[PDB]
Structure 1
Amino acid sequence: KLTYYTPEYETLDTDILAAFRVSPQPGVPPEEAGAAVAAESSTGTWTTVWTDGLTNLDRYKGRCYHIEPVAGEENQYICYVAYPLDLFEEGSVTNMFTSIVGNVFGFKALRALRLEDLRIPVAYVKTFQGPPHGIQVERDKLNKYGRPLLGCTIKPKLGLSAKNYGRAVYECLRGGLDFTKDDENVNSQPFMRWRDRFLFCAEALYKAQAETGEIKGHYLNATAGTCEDMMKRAVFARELGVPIVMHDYLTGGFTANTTLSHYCRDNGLLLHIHRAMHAVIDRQKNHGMHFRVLAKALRLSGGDHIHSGTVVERDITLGFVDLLRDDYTEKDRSRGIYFTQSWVSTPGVLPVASGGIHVWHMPALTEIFGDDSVLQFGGGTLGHPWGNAPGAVANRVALEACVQARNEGRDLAREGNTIIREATKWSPELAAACEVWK
C-alpha cells in the first residue's frame, strides 16, 4: 500500500492512465485493493529481491492515484492507475495490453476486475500508424458524401458455392448498396475455398459497378491461421484491384492485425474490422474489458471500419463512437468516458451498425449515428420478398428519404415513420419491404 497508493500524485501528460472497476474480496479495503491493482500490473514482488537496488523502481512503478466508490453497487470502486511512458513498446498494442491487463485479473485479493477506459497519451499515440485511411480519405476514394454507407452480409454464411455466393453479391450491389460482406466465419473451408470466393466476388462487384455507375466493394475476409496465409489473401485482393478487405482482429490477434493494417496503408486497401469474440470479454459489468478499450486499441493498431453494435445503452455507445471518430473527446462520465482523449490527427474510424435491422430502423440509425457510419443489412436485404436487388433498393430509398427529410429540417425522432410511409407511396420496392417487416 505504501509504495502504490499515491493519492497526491499528479499525472504526467506522458502517462498511460487506467480506470479499473475493482470488486475487492470482503475484508480488503479500497486503498489496499487499488494499491494491489497498481503493483500487480507493474513492479510488485511477493518477496524482496536484491536486483531492485540496481535501478530506481519509482521510475517504473504503476500508481493508484485516485479511488471513488461506485454508486449503487455493493463493495465496488473505480481505481485510477498511472503507468509511465517508458514501460511500453512503441507502436505495439500487444505490449500495451500485456503490461496493463496481462496479470492483475487473476489477483486473489480481488473477486472481479474490469478495465473501463485508458487515456492514451499523445506521445504514445504518435508511435502508431493508426487507420490505413480513415473516414475522410475513404469518402474521397469512394466518392460518397452526405449519407451513411450501406452494406449487406451474405447468408447463409456457410453452404453456398463460391459462384452462388457471387451471384448474391451482384444482386445486392446493383440495387443500391455500397458494400456486401463476408461473414466473420467465412475464411477458407471445404465447400468454398478463399481464392474461388475472391475471384467470383470480384466478377460480381465489377458487373454491379458497371451497371449502376457507383463504386462498389465487398469485404473480402483475409482472416487466416498464420500471418503468411493472411498475407496471401490480402495480396490477391490487391491483384484484383478491389477496394476493401476484412479481418477479425480479436480472433486473429493484434500482432497479425497491425501487419495487415500496415500492408493496407502501403497498398491503398481499405480495412473492415469485425469484432468477433468481443462479448466473451466485454459483456459482464463486473469482469473483463469494456468495448471502448478494445475500440481505442483498434484505432491505434489500425482499421477503417469497426463494428460497434446496433443501439436500436445509447449513451455508452455514442460515447465510444465519438472516441472512434473524433480528434478530441472530453471526459464525460454520463457516457462512460473516464478520461479526456486526444488523437493528434490520427484518422477516425467509421462505426458499423449491424444486427437484425431493417427499413423501419432507418430514421433512428440516421439520427443516432449521423452521416459517418456504415449500416449493415444482412437479412434486411436478403429477406425482401422480391429478392436481393429490390431489397437493396428499399434500403437505399429509405435511407435517402431520411437524409433528404433531415436536410429539409424534419425531426427524424418525431416523424421517422411518416417519412418512410411517404416514400412507400412512390417506391413499390420500399412499400413491399414495409409490408413484411413492421
Structure 2
Amino acid sequence: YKLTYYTPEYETKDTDILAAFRVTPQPGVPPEEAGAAVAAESSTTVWTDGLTSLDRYKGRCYHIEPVVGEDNQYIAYVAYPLDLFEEGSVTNMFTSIVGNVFGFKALRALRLEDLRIPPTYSKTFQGPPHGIQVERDKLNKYGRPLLGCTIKPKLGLSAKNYGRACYECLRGGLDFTKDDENVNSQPFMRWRDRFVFCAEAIYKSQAETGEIKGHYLNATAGTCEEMIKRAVFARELGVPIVMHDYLTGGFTANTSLAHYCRDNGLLLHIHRAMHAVIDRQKNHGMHFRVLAKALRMSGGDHIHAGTVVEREMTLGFVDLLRDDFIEKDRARGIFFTQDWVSMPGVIPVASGGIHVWHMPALTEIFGDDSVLQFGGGTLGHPWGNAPGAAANRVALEACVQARNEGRDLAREGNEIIRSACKWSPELAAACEIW
C-alpha cells in the first residue's frame, strides 16, 4: 500500500536511521508509489504478522520530490527504526538498507546518496582506532597536511628494493610511504619479507631526520587469520601504522582489524579500492559519502578521499569524515544533519596525479587535517626519491607559511611556489618538469 509505506506526514524520530535515495521509477510508476516501494522493499501477508506489530518495524518514505538530476528522477527520504539494526555492525546496516531494494523491477535505477546515523546507533561502534587528534599527538606533527608517497612500480620489485625506495622517500621529508592496494603477499614479494625491509627503512629514515616516520603496511588478506597475522608482526616490529582495503576485504574483517589496532596502538590507513564500481554513476549505486560514513563507523584513521585536480561534493564528505557536527547542505551532498557525538574523525587522503604545483590548491581546499599522497609526483623527480620528497615537503611548507601570514593560496599559489624555488634547488628542478 502506498500509504502503509508512504507517510508524508511522518515526523522522524531522533533514533531513526534515515536514508536519502535517488530513485528512477520505471515508466508508469508514480513517485509516491516508487517511494513507498523503496521503503517497503528495504524493510517489511502471512499469519505470523499477527504475532507482532509490523508498524514498529517498517521503513517509511516520509518525503519524495522530483530531482533536478535528470529524466524522471526523485530523491526519496526513508526512515528506519533503531531496532532493525545490530549494534556495531556496518555489515548489518548495509544488508538491512541496501541488501534487496536495488533489484526491484518497478525501479529503473536506484542510488543511495546519504544516511543519517543517529547517536543511539553510532555510539555502538568503536569508530577510528585513534582519529585525527590522537594521530597528530602520537606522531608529534602539527600545523600542516601530512605527506606520503606510494611506492612504484606497483608489482615486480623485490622486498628489499621496495624498502630501499621507502627509505629514500622518507629521508627526504615525507611522513609516510605506502604499499599499493594490490600489494598484499605475492610470488615476487611475500608480505613478511616486505614488513622486515620496510621496518628497516622506517627506522633508518627516522634516525637520520629526527622526525617520526611510517609506512602503511598492507594487511589486506584472503582470510581474517592472515590479516591479523600481518597486523601482529607489524605490532612486533613496533611500527606506527598498517593498511587495509576495507571494501575488497569487507566490513566484517575491517571492523575486526580496527579493533586490533585500537587494542595495540596501531594507526590504520584505509584504501578504498573498488569504490568506483559502486559510486561512479549518478543514477545507480551508492555515493562515496555513504561508504565514507561507513568506514568512520567501522574504523579507520586515514581514508582515501580522491583528488581535487566535483569540489563541493568532495568537501562535503570531507566534513562528514572529520567534523563532529555537519549541518544539512544538499549543495555539498549532505542530505542530513549529522552529529557524531564525539566519535573521532578520519584524516582524508588526497592522491592521484598531484605534483608540487598543486600544493597551493590542495592545502587551500583540504586544510591541515589531510594527507597529500603523491606517486610520480615524488618518484618522478629528476634527482630521485629523496630530492623529490624534499621538493614536496618544501613546496608544502611554503604554502603553509604563506597561508599563515594571511596570503591567498588560491590567487597567489604560483608566486608562492616560484618564490620557494629561489632557495630550494630541489623544488626548482621539480617545477621544471611539471
TM-score by length of 1: 0.98
Q: Distance in 1 between matches of 2:374 and 2:73?
A: 39
Find the partner of 2:186 among 163, 186, 189: 189
Hey, what's the Cα distance between the residues in 2 that align with 1:17 and 1:289? Answer: 15
Structure 1 residue 383, shift from structure 2 partner: 0.5
Deviation of 1:426 after TM superposition, in Å, equals 0.8
CA displacement at 1:74 relative to structure 2:
1.2
Deviation at 1:2, TM superposition (A): 2.5
Report how far residue 378 of structure 1 moved: 1.1
Deviation at 1:409, TM superposition (A): 1.0
Q: Specify the alignment match of 1:39 in structure 2.
A: 40
Q: Over residues 36-91 of structure 1, what are the superposed CA-to-partner deviations in whole Å (9 max), with x where a residue is unaligned?
A: 0000000xxxx921110001000000000001110252111100000000000000
Q: Which residue of 2 aligns with 1:247?
A: 244
CA offsets per residue over residues 111-162 of structure 1, 9 Å max, x none?
A: 0000000000000010000000000000000000000000000000100000
Output the CA distance in 2 between the equivalents of 1:255 and 1:206: 33
String of CA shifts for 1:249-296, please: whole Å, max 9, x gaps.
Answer: 000000000000000000000000000000000000000000000000
- Please provide the CA RMSD for this pair: 0.8
Residue in structure 1 matching 2:129, options 132, 137, 148: 132
* Helix, strand or coil at the partner of 1:90: coil
CA distance in 2, matches of 1:274, 1:236: 20
Query: CA deviation digits over 1:328-354, x for unaligned, max 9?
Result: 000001111000000000000000000
Residue 208 of structure 2: aligned partner: 211
SS in 2 for 1:79: strand
CA distance in 2, matches of 1:277, 1:82: 28
How many Å separate the matches in 2 of 1:241 and 1:138? 15
SS at match of 2:177: strand
Identity of aligned residues (%): 92
For residue 389 of structure 1, give the secondary structure of its aligned residue in structure 2: helix
Structure 2 distance, partners of 1:246, 1:91, is: 21
Query: Which residue of structure 1 aligns with residue 383 of structure 2?
Result: 386
Q: Which runs of 4+ in 1 moved over 2 A?
A: none
* Alignment partners' CA distance in 2, 1:357 and 1:74: 36
Structure 2 distance, partners of 1:402, 1:64, is 48
Deviations 1:292-319 (A, max 9, x none): 0000000000000000001120000000
- Per-residue CA deviations over 1:156-185 (Å, capped at 9, x if unaligned) read 010000000000000000000000000000
Deviation, structure 1 residue 425: 0.8
2:235 aligned with 1:238: yes
**1:352 & 1:292 partners in 2: Cα distance?**
14
- Aligned: 1:356 with 2:357: no
| Equivalent position of 1:313 in the other structure | 310
SS at 1:2's partner residue?
helix
* TM-score, normalisation: structure 2: 0.99
How far is the alpha carbon of 1:377 from its aligned partner?
Answer: 0.8
Hey, what's the Cα distance between the residues in 2 that align with 1:271 and 1:206?
A: 19
- Relative distance call for 1:72 and 1:248 in structure 2 (3 A) is closer
When residues 169 and 298 of structure 1 are mapped into structure 2, their CA distance, relative to the original with a 3 A threshold, is: same
For residues 236-258 of structure 1, what are the alpha-carbon distances to aligned partners after superposition, in whole Å with 9 as ceiling and x for unaligned?
00000000000000000000000
Residue aligning to 1:221: 218
State the distance in 1 between where 2:70 and 2:386 align: 51
